[PDB]
Amino acid sequence: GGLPSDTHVYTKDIGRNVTIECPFKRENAPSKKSLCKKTNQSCELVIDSTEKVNPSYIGRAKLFMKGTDLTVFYVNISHLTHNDAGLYICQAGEGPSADKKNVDLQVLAPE
Numbered sequence: 468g469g470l471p472s473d474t475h476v477y478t479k480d481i482g483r484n485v486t487i488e489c490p491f492k493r494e495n496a497p498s499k500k501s502l503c504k505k506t507n508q509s510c511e512l513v514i515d516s517t518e519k520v521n522p523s524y525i526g527r528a529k530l531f532m533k534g535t536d537l538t539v540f541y542v543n544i545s546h547l548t549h550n551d552a553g554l555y556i557c558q559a560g561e562g563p564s565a566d567k568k569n570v571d572l573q574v575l576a577p578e
């Protein structure tokens with residue numbers, strides 16, 4: 468059951484949607500906001516605030532903020548597939564001072 472530090476787990480049935488919460492600090496409010504998916508030593512872009520999106524998620528992923536809450540962004544992923552399962556990282560900013568949040572998506576799929 469090893470996880471990255473302070474991981475938020477989301478559990479969804481196949482074909483449903485998930486809204487991932489990505490907290491950050493004021494220092495990174497002006498910076499790029501992104502979600503990426505872990506591979507063992509790579510994190511592959513899912514979507515970022517420059518409107519770049521992974522072809523495997525286009526039409527299914529949306530990145531937004533809400534109200535005047537200046538300290539959190541959201542990524543909704545719809546039409547979940549078993550291949551969407553796994554670890555993701557939220558990032559606000561770039562480099563050593565970036566705010567990161569570890570996320571684990573569990574997708575329950577047919578036997």
Ligand SMILES: *[C@@H]1O[C@H](CO)[C@@H](O)[C@H](O)[C@H]1NC(C)=O
Pocket residue numbers: 483484485545
């Ligand atoms: C997304 O899932 C929520 C449950 O968290 C549900 O209320 C909502 O209707 C779903 N939206 C779509 C477009 O499937």
